[PDB]
Ligand binder design. Structure first.
Ligand SMILES: [Cl-]
Ligand SMILES: [Cl-]
Ligand SMILES: [Cl-]
Lengths: 185, 183, 179, 185
């Protein structure tokens, strides 16, 4: 007889709400989480990535509500530094093959406990970190093997507002949703 | 209850909604998630792209040529949007607006429109302060879940896929101007 | 009504017969060869996305002695490039009244209206579609256009709706297997 | 009474599993397989193609598991050489009008039997090669006429992780899935 709470994305288990209430740091993977997993490449070496505006708003709400937001990704691109800058994200880790290193560095840097960390991932590479945190999240269309492992599976797909969904959940859990705002720096 | 509905090419529409659309003299659109899918394309050399829908363009032209004003209010700022606005003949463009109510009040004052004569299409919470005040508030099909139950009308078509066109068509139909409209 | 099975599902015998007479395929661009999106950038860049399977269908028609033309209201050099990569030599851009180009194609190619197929996605395409042998609306064309066409594709614009019509025409003309 | 094996993508026939167990070389077509079939063209002659990071991880898993990966396409673009370089793919054939020419070179140079080859296609142009291999694969949204011809039809659409799905199947079939390692690029 699990207890659930209605949210604007559907019912969420009380255990998940309780985990979300302790979050002081949200860590996000990029490709497949903030985007639908696509990398656009051109003939003169151009590269584009598509980000979702609604996720941006969620990220700003967290940051303005004293909840740190960090990024850990295996890829490396100037465009992501630009994106992080527009969102006010100062903790960006690119070109990371082993995500635990960046994760442990964040814990020490921010003097945060693992139970105070939420992590949104989409592939197996994310699991070693997700296995240790207070709130592990797999996006709706994450690799099938990651889905049953996470504390929460988002209703929204990667690149369509899965990050916003987790931002909304964390703020709801901490009774900060009604008053939160996400204006730019 | 027993609500009356009018059949439209997008499905049944409440009579209440048809009456609201019948009085529209100004359509205000948010951009990201309304005229687009909600995505921003960013590149390594600082390039930025946004994708607009051709079908929306046609609808906007039908409104403008039918003496129905169209305006854009957005918190973002990009030359690409000035370009898009120009191609559509939109002369009421407001970018970098953190408080959308400022631009909204200026438009009503300058265009001599009453709030009941204004329609607004949004996709997120920042659009609600303006939507709360207008005659026809519209949330796109895939708008943030919290906005959906608040709007007078929710489009069947998703943001960036013709949700703007759908509203343009609804307004024209409600005013007996759908047939004969050119865009 | 008699239906004939196709790799896209049953097609009415009436449509197969119409397809069998086609000598010219005319396509609109936005919403037909693409999903209706136009990408715009801050330095004035513009992109449009085309479907590779559609390209193959077009080449099959051209090599099977069936002409392929394009009539669009927009104008962009990117479209000239696409047309050229497909071997399309009949391209009409910046066309406000699509009937003008249509009547010109009939003359240039000494073609009859019943020998023309037209794939559209919006109301501006109807004046021409109303007059041809095989009018086609893409799966996700404007709702008002859908019930007016002789055939509605199962595949959406930009996802292979053009290839579908190409396959249908060739099937009807016993030219599919050898294409 | 066909026997099936449950995979993270759903049941897979025992016949397909046995075919996947013998694979030493995976050949991929590009457009509609590694991408959703779209070509982006610009007014200044720019050209872009979008690849999926989930597929990159699968390819790296194959290569690091001593399973070769090759690409054969009729198109030609510098962007594809760039994508192949990022994935460590060294067997790249572009502008190939007759795909069988490249296919025969690969088997000869790699000392690989047709039965040891898997090929992922999306259109009729791919059939001459698929007809000859041990594991022919059509992506979920491949041209309708190719679907009934392949040994296996992927659950995932072109450009959304159909390649990854095949990489996972081959590894599972060879008991190398759990130990597989790759990078989300
Ligand atoms: Cl944003
Ligand atoms: Cl337009
Ligand atoms: Cl092509």
């Amino acid at each position: 007889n699990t207890a659930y709470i209605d949210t604007c994305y559907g019912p969420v288990a009380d255990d998940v709400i309780q985990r979300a209430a302790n979050i002081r740091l949200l860590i996000c993977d990029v490709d497949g989480v903030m985007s639908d997993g696509l990398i656009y490449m051109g003939n003169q070496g151009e590269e584009l990535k598509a980000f979702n505006v609604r996720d941006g708003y969620g990220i700003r709400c967290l940051i303005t509500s004293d909840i740190d937001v960090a990024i850990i990704t295996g890829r490396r691109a100037k465009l992501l530094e630009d994106r992080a800058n527009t969102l006010g994200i100062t903790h960006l880790y690119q070109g990371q093959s082993d995500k635990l290193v960046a994760y442990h560095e964040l814990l020490a840097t921010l003097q945060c406990q693992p139970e105070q960390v939420a992590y949104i991932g989409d592939d197996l590479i994310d699991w070693p970190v997700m296995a240790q945190v207070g709130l592990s999240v797999a996006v709706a269309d994450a690799h099938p093997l990651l889905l049953p492992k996470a504390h929460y599976v988002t209703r929204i797909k990667g690149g369509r507002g899965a990050v916003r969904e987790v931002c909304d959940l964390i703020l709801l859990a901490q009774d900060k949703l009604e008053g939160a705002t996400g204006l730019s720096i």
